[PDB]
């Protein structure tokens, strides 16, 4: 048999019939519900902690467990990812992965509207999240072996990997459209990041699936490590509570928003390039091989910290990564039509939002905009809501449907052009005015509603602009000319660049 099949008392009987017949030690394993699957992941120190005080019996115990057919690596699971090839995962990670909370990521397109411009970009958050987890694992392993003085444990590594896996837990339908266009527009009062949803959903994941006990049984300390995991995804003398200041570098793996160099970017760069038809100059594996924890000393009292570093000549590599970042952003992410589709889906969602009910915990109904408040409602919120609306028989959604039908028949708002501000920029709060301005700027009646203005924001490491697109809803030729020249005049008026 496998140890997977063994209940805790089966393990206890195995322990007994192998020579450990003392009630207290059996009580340990009965108490912690240590099913068989955990056995090959047990340590001398783990057995010490669990509470066997026999300096010799720990060794005997581990010998007994070693003599079994099945080993540690024999319980790891192998994914075959077209980006990273095959991928080993520690069973705990699988247990996190095999939950509604996480499986839900299979039903959210990574590039959202992108799929409707790049037919290759059919990929969802799920596979990318797996990827990120794996990469996190890779970098932390590499640093662990190159520098054993770092005292980096299995615990730490798994926490980093789980943070990796679960960073994108809280993305809404069509990914960044939802949190970047829909929510800000539907709930202007509330500031919301997909990360907030990520950590909330992680909490909901482990609580729904009761994985805390499992985490404990595989040698994690839920109380500390969950806070560590959360902190890695979210953020904040030493601010963090998850780990001591001495292990600061660990926080630079999963989400390094400081200098924008993390494994999330690596994975989705590679993946998105794989699916788009672009190819990525940035070789992360050679960032990893050239990676070192290093001691940085800057005086502000002198501040000495352990940061992740790359050799001096891996600066040319970083030139690529930031080019690939822009390369992708320029061509694909802020693609004029992809964004148009995101805008139209947003518009549909907005006009669908009042009528669509989505049940959460205890079956309380939530609107599309408020599902973010309850994870068990949010768990049911996916891209599929697109098709639910489109196919709904309710005549209240005529408005929302009609937009979705237009998306289906490629009857999209036509893109008049792009422009740049010569000096200054547009205040985040100034936006709602812009469609009025463009409409009223005359060179046919053209309402403020007929126009959409899309504002786009272009956007250390240690060694050892604004784009404005205008779209018009009215698609007929006369109005098209009128709108075009309206746009040009608006550009001239605000002293903007020559339109595209
Ligand atoms: N279709 C489309 N996708 C976008 C746009 N902006 C960002 N994305 C997608 C492209 C990336 O594959 C994906 C990365 O999101 P992550 O949650 O992994 O990273 P993060 O939260 O730092 O967002 P960011 O790096 O700013 O894109 O977001 C956009 O304007 N249009
Ligand atoms: N028309 C269309 N394009 C798709 C589809 N899937 C991916 N794409 C790509 C091919 C197109 O080059 C790209 C943009 O499509 P559009 O025809 O809507 O571009 P645009 O509105 O500028 O129209 P135009 O090319 O000026 O007639 O989207 C699809 O189902 N229909
Ligand atoms: N490699 C690469 N692919 C692109 C680029 N822009 C779009 N694509 C992809 C997505 C589309 O499915 C296809 C061609 O899209 P285009 O932007 O060239 O034409 P689109 O109809 O979107 O705009 P258009 O009306 O022709 O100005 O190739 C690009 O700049 N580089
Ligand atoms: Mg086209």
Q: How far apart are CA 212 and CA 195, in angstroms?
A: 21
CB 372 within 8 A of CB 159: no
Q: How far is the CA of 337 from the centre of ligand 2 (A)?
A: 8
CA dist., res. 229 & res. 164, Å (int)? 9
Domain limits, the chain? 8-74, 77-333, 414-459+465-493
Fold of the CATH domain 8-74: DNA polymerase; domain 1 (1.10.150)
Q: Is the backbone of residue 54 left (phi > 0), alpha (psi -120 to 50) or beta?
A: beta
Cα separation, 16 vs 208, whole angstroms: 34
How many angstroms separate the CA atoms of 219 and 209, rounded? 18
* Distance from C-alpha of 383 to C-alpha of 400, rounded to nearest angstrom: 15
Cα distances from 154 to residues 30, 157, 178, 225, in angstroms, run: 25, 5, 36, 12
Reported residue count of the chain is 500
Per the DSSP assignment, residues forming a β-bridge with 297 are 304
Residues contacting residue 53 through CB under 8 Å, at least 6 positions apart = none
Fold (topology level) of 414-459+465-493: Alpha-Beta Plaits (3.30.70)
Residue 297 backbone phi and psi in degrees, to 5? -125, 110
Q: How far is CA 213 from the centre of its chain?
A: 25
Token pair 């590599």 in the structure block, residue? 317
Q: 191 to each of 42, 179, 180, 187, 188, how far by Cα in Å?
A: 44, 9, 10, 8, 7
Q: Give ligand 1 pocket residues (Cβ under 6 A).
A: 110-114, 168, 175-176, 264, 268, 272, 333-334, 338-339
Q: 358 φ, ψ to 5°?
A: -135, 120
Closest residue to atom 1 of ligand 3, CA basis: 278
Our answer on whether the CB atom of 119 is closer than 6 Å to any ligand 2 atom is yes
C-alpha to C-alpha distance for 318 and 282, rounded to whole angstroms: 7
Two tokens at 376? 């068990």
> Which residue out of 277, 280, 338, 339 has the highest number of ligand 3 atoms within 8 Å of its CB and is therefore the one to mutate?
277
Superfamily of domain 77-333: Hypothetical protein af1432 (1.10.3210.10)
Ligand 4 center from residue 389 Cα (angstroms) = 26
457 alpha carbon – ligand 3 mean position (Å): 21
Query: d(Cα 223, Cα 215) in Å, to the nearest integer?
Result: 10
Pocket residue to mutate for ligand 3, from 113, 114, 331, 410, most atoms within 8 A of Cβ = 331
Told to judge if 194 belongs to the known catalytic residues of this protein, a careful annotator would answer yes
Q: Which of 337, 405, 452 to mutate to test the pocket of ligand 2 (most atoms within 8 A of CB)?
A: 337
124 has which bridge partners?
109
Ligand 4 center–CA 374 separation, angstroms: 39
CB 278 within 8 A of CB 268: no
Entry resolution (Å)? 3.5
- Residue 30 in contact with residue 8, Cβ under 8 Å? yes
Q: Which ligand number lies closest to the CA of residue 339? A: 1
Method: X-ray
Selected catalytic residue, list 90, 123, 128, 194: 194
Q: How far is the CA of 414 from the centre of ligand 4 (A)?
A: 10
């Amino acid at each position: 048999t496998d140890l997977r099949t063994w209940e805790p008392e089966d393990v206890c009987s195995f322990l007994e019939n192998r020579g450990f017949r003392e009630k207290k030690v059996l009580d340990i394993f009965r108490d912690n519900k240590i099913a068989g699957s955990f056995l090959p992941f047990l340590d001398e120190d783990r057995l010490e902690d669990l509470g066997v005080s026999s300096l010799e019996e720990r060794k005997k115990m581990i010998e007994c467990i070693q003599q079994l057919s099945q080993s540690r690596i024999d319980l790891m699971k192998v994914f075959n990812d077209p980006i990273h090839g095959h991928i080993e995962f520690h069973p705990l990670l699988i247990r996190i992965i095999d939950t509604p909370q996480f499986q839900r990521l299979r039903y959210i397109k990574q590039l959202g509207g992108g799929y409707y411009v790049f037919p290759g970009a059919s990929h969802n958050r799920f596979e990318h999240s797996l990827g990120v987890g794996y990469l996190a694992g890779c970098l932390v392993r590499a640093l662990a072996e190159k520098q054993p003085e770092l005292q980096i444990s299995e615990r730490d590594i798994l926490c980093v990997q789980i943070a990796g896996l679960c960073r994108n837990l809280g993305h809404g339908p069509f990914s960044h459209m939802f949190d970047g266009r829909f929510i800000p527009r539907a709930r202007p009062e509330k500031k919301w990041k997909h990360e907030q949803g990520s950590i909330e959903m992680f909490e909901h994941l482990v609580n729904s699936n009761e994985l805390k006990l499992v985490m404990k049984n595989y040698g994690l300390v839920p109380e500390e490590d969950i806070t560590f995991i959360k902190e890695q995804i979210m953020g904040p003398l030493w601010p963090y509570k998850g780990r001591p200041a001495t292990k600061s570098f660990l926080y630079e793996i999963v989400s390094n928003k400081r200098n924008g160099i993390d494994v999330d970017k690596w994975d989705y760069f590679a993946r998105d390039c794989h699916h788009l038809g672009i190819q990525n100059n940035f070789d992360y594996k050679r960032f990893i091989k050239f990676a070192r924890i290093c001691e940085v000393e800057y005086k502000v009292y002198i501040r000495k910290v352990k940061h992740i570093c790359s050799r001096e000549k891996e600066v040319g590599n970083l030139y690529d990564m930031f080019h690939t970042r822009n390369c992708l952003h320029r061509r694909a992410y802020q693609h004029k039509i992809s964004n148009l589709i995101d805008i139209m889906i947003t518009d549909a969602f907005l006009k669908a939002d009042p009528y669509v009910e989505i049940t959460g915990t205890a079956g309380k109904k939530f609107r599309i905009s408020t599902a973010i408040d309850d994870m068990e409602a949010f768990t049911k919120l996916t891209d599929n809501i697109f098709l639910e609306v489109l196919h709904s028989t309710d005549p209240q959604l005529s408005e929302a449907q009609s937009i979705l039908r237009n998306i289906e028949c490629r009857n999209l708002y036509k893109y008049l052009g792009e422009t740049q501000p010569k000096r200054e920029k547009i205040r985040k709060e100034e936006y709602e005015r812009l469609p009025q301005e463009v409409a009223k700027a005359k060179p046919v009646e053209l309402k403020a509603e007929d126009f959409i203005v899309d504002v786009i924001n272009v956007d250390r490491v240690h060694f050892y602009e604004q784009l404005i697109r205008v779209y018009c809803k009215k698609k007929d030729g006369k109005s098209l000319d009128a709108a075009g020249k309206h746009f040009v005049q608006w550009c001239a008026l605000r002293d903007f660049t020559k339109p595209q």
